[PDB]
């Protein structure tokens, strides 16, 4: 048998290596309970990309004007070669700004003292104060600017909770900040809102009383947790992931099941059962096993697991208890193997033995369960009716408050089927039971009498289970589908018998604090799942729209799965990963992230033009051109357009590798125009321009069949060049061949850069939403049910 067990372990390990779950089934509980809620992150400093600098200008003839004009520049200049790398950096910045997305701004605290204004007013940010000082000390500005900088005033309307501050920023930064301000995620928190946020089924109860004691401040600001339904349909073609999710839910549900108290003495019950069964087996009966079985049963019914049935057929009491088990738990909660095995054993060991009928010849896999055949073959009204009731006992599909749930039938809920089971068993007790030996029949019918003699306690136990299931299921947020899964949970038949024969008169309802703990943990997990799904779909959609084709979606899906804290990436199968990716590709992105991407794509041209370490492209033109004069630089090869020259994308040629076109167009001397993110060498050497150098910076393109090393040259001729005296003292038209596709950096304009911000005065962030409610349970003895009858009616 040991070799057989080794072989079965090998097979089950091969199966298990396709399931993302850690080896011990308890660390999932710790990881789930350690999942912090959606973190509230404010912005200590304003999100700014553009800052002003001081640069000298030149006369059109090429001498310094003595003026110091303010220009614009990036905070960080890290845009590398290649258009693809530029767009990859753009996607990285998109991710950075998505993570850095704030939720609420207290613009009063961010304000700093100002010295420029004579009214000792406030300013929004330290950077604004510094740039204001820079524009204040300098004397190259208008007087009306000074009047405005002296008369700019903040305003605080505390009654309506509105405050404004003046700011100086570039339009992109101001648009970003204003969009963040006006699209806040926080909503007012009223007593009615916090009262209706509590699940309504628990509110309607009478066992619990919900009293509002904490006083909500009139400035209550709370973030509504996301409650969107699942968008992946994790019930078909996702067996492994769904199994992992439902196992995690099973562990979490097992963590919150209350324990039983003061069951009847075990030793006395063992003695009585041994005497009554007339034994010449019954081992493994302890209160610990009963509690574990009860917790397993309730948790499995809650988290929609699948339960396998384990038994030893030599213990007929195991099948007798399994009769009750099948009556209470709907048969659709198990796997087909266990159901057919249990049905065949029960039918061919108790009933058909007692009714003088041939043993049920049967074939595995028929569309009808054996219980149906039993129903349409026995004309004894009691047991036939009971068999029919078990036959058509299935989970009922209902929708409550837009949440899908599976609930039991009403008849079992009030504890009434136990009377039917007891009557059927008592009918079997006095039955003739023909063609069976003496002691076996006597033991069978005496065990049946033993289980029948516990009618009131069984009724109380089953309806207590029903009430606990209702209460626990009330707070479930995510919907539960119903589909068979790979793995199962081992249910001990002996433990089921122990629970059936050892249930006392102890009422046990879930503790209110345990209920709220479970509800908070579940909603936190749901919020994390939804937000990670949203981030993943936004990342993939933005990368696809911006033409980033090398972004392996497998890495993004890997990160998304790993950030769920309940999986293990190193075990997942590739085909299921691809199916999940294809599911994700077709969902519409949430509006905030889409609008952020739209703003990024509308500002990307300006951002790329702003950098001085990158250029759009180069034109050679193979012809003499008069140099175009500019105010920023003395003499530059400025080409603000690509008119009249054919355009070829460098990155396209590089990735495709077809070098014939550019090689011919370079060797045969035809004008062209290369376009691509290329750094350029600044050449402050007029003699270097005289000795033509911008005609050999393309030879390496055909020498080594590569484009990354391509480093064009831009000539910057000014007075400070160590050789500028050639231009001033000699008469010659500035002649060159290579131009650079570049736009002049935007001149600093004050009347449009100035902007006013809008925000609330002050408030506090509330996320817990459970410290403001108290729920004191009634005395455990007097608990009632839906029908206003007491939960346990046996005393």
């Amino acid at each position: 048998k040991t070799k057989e067990e080794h072989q079965k372990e090998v097979q089950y390990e091969i199966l298990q290596k396709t399931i993302p779950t850690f080896e011990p089934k308890e660390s999932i509980l710790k990881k789930l309970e350690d999942i912090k809620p959606e973190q509230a992150k404010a912005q200590t400093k304003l999100f700014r990309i553009f800052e002003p600098r001081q640069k000298p200008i030149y006369i059109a003839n090429g001498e310094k004007e003595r003026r110091n004009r303010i220009y614009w520049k990036l905070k960080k200049d890290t845009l590398p070669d290649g258009d693809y790398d530029v767009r990859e950096y753009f996607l990285n910045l998109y991710d950075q700004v998505l993570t850095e997305m704030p939720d609420y701004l207290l613009l009063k605290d961010m304000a700093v003292e100002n010295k420029n204004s004579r009214d000792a007013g406030k300013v929004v940010d330290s950077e604004t104060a510094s740039i204001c000082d820079a524009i204040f000390q300098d004397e190259e500005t208008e007087g009306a600017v000074a009047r405005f900088i002296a008369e700019m005033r903040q305003r605080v309307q505390a009654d309506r909770n509105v405050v404004n501050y003046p700011s100086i920023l570039h339009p992109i930064d101001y648009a970003f900040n204003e969009y963040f301000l006006q699209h806040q995620l926080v909503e007012p928190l009223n007593n009615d809102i916090i009262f209706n946020y509590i699940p309504e089924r628990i509110r309607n109860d009478v066992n619990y009383i919900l009293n509002m004691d904490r006083n909500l401040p009139s400035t209550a600001r709370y973030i509504r947790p996301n409650l969107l339904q699942d968008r992946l349909n994790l019930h078909d073609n996702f067996e492994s992931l769904w199994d992992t999710i439902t196992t995690s839910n099973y562990i979490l549900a097992r963590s919150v099941v209350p324990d039983l108290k003061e069951l009847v003495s075990t030793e006395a019950q063992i003695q009585k059962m041994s005497q009554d069964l007339q034994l010449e087996f019954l081992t493994g009966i302890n209160s610990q096993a009963a509690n574990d079985c009860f917790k397993t049963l309730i948790a499995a019914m809650l988290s929609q697991r699948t339960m396998s049935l384990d038994f030893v057929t030599t213990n007929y009491m195991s099948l007798i208890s399994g009769m009750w088990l099948l009556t209470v738990v709907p048969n659709d909660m198990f796997i087909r193997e266990s159901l057919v095995a249990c049905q065949l054993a029960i039918v061919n060991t108790i009933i058909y033995v007692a009714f003088g009928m041939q043993r049920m010849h049967y074939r595995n896999g028929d569309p009808q369960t054996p219980f149906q055949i039993a129903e349409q073959q026995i004309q004894n009204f009691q047991v036939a009716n009971w068999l029919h009731f078990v036959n058509n006992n299935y989970f009922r599909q209902v929708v409550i408050d837009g949440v899908l749930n599976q609930v039991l039938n009403d008849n079992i809920r009030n504890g009434h089927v136990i009377n039917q089971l007891m009557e059927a068993l008592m009918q079997l007790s006095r039955q003739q039971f023909p063609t069976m030996p003496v002691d076996y029949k006597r033991s069978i019918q005496r065990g049946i009498l033993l289980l029948s003699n516990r009618l009131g306690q069984l009724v109380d136990l089953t309806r207590l289970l029903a009430y606990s299931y209702e209460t626990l299921m009330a707070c479930v947020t995510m919907n539960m589908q119903h589909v068979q899964t790979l793995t199962t949970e081992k249910l001990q038949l002996t433990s089921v018998t122990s629970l059936c024969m050892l249930i006392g008169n102890a009422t046990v309802i879930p503790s209110p604090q345990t209920l709220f703990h479970y509800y908070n943990v579940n909603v936190n997990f749901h919020s994390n799942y939804n937000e990670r799904i949203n981030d993943a779909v936004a990342i993939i959609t933005a990368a696809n729209r911006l033409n980033l084709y090398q972004k392996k979606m497998k890495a993004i899906v890997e990160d998304f799965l790993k950030r769920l804290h309940i999986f293990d990436v190193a075990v997942a199968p590739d085909d299921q990963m691809y199916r999940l990716r294809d599911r994700l590709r077709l969902l519409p992105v949430e509006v905030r992230r889409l609008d952020i991407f739209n703003l990024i794509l509308m500002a990307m041209d300006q951002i790329e033009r702003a950098s001085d370490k990158i250029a759009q492209g180069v034109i050679i033109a193979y012809r003499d051109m008069q140099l175009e004069r500019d105010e920023m630089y003395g003499y530059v090869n400025i080409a603000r357009n690509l008119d009249g020259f054919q355009q070829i994308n460098l990155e396209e040629l590089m990735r495709t590798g077809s070098y014939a076109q550019i090689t011919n167009m370079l060797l045969n001397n035809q004008p062209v125009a290369l376009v691509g993110a290329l750094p350029f060498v600044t050449d402050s050497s007029v003699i270097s321009l005289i000795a033509i150098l911008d005609a050999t910076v393309f030879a390496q393109i055909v020498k080594l069949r590569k484009v990354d090393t391509l480093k064009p040259i831009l000539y910057k001729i000014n007075s400070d060049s160590n050789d500028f005296y050639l231009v001033a003292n000699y008469d010659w038209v500035p002649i060159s061949t290579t131009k650079v596709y570049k736009q002049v950096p935007v001149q600093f304009d004050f009347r449009n850069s100035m902007h006013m911000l809008t925000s609330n005065l002050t408030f506090t962030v509330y996320s817990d939403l459970l410290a403001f409610v108290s729920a004191d349970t009634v005395e455990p003895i007097n608990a009632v049910a839906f029908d206003n009858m007491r939960i346990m009616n046996e005393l």
Partner: protein, 133 residues
């Protein structure tokens, strides 16, 4: 009954707002509607005709999902959409043609064609994009 009008509106929108050059952001909702419709209607077989000289034709539905990745619609997307657009236009034309002539003395409001009978079932009610005419 309204399902037919929703299908006609969906087909008209798909034919008119899906050409080369349109940015995807203009027709994202139409893309979602078309995906939902093609998913729900897939796998179900219909029949038309059966009276007069109106021809009897069968129907099938096995089509792929329209993409949602490219920033701006391209010609391949146009052809892929227009093939299914043509097939569905033919289908709705034959359905309405069959539903016109058939009539009954009682229950005039009640649809008389099996196509409409299965259209108003409990599984097809997920495509009711518009009722505005």
């Amino acid at each position: 009954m309204d399902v037919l009008y929703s299908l006609s509106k969906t087909l008209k929108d798909a034919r008119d707002k899906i050409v080369e050059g349109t940015l995807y952001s203009n027709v994202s909702d139409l893309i979602q509607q078309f995906n939902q419709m093609i998913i729900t209607m897939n796998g179900n077989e219909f029949q038309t005709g059966g009276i007069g000289n109106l021809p009897i034709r069968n129907w099938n539905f096995n089509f792929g999902l329209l993409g949602t990745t490219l920033l701006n619609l391209d010609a391949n997307y146009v052809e892929t959409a227009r093939n299914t657009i043509d097939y569905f236009v033919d289908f709705v034309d034959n359905v309405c043609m069959d539903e016109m002539v058939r009539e009954s003395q009682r229950n005039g409001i009640a649809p008389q064609s099996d196509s409409l009978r299965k259209l108003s079932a409990i599984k097809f009610k997920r495509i009711n994009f518009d009722n505005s005419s």
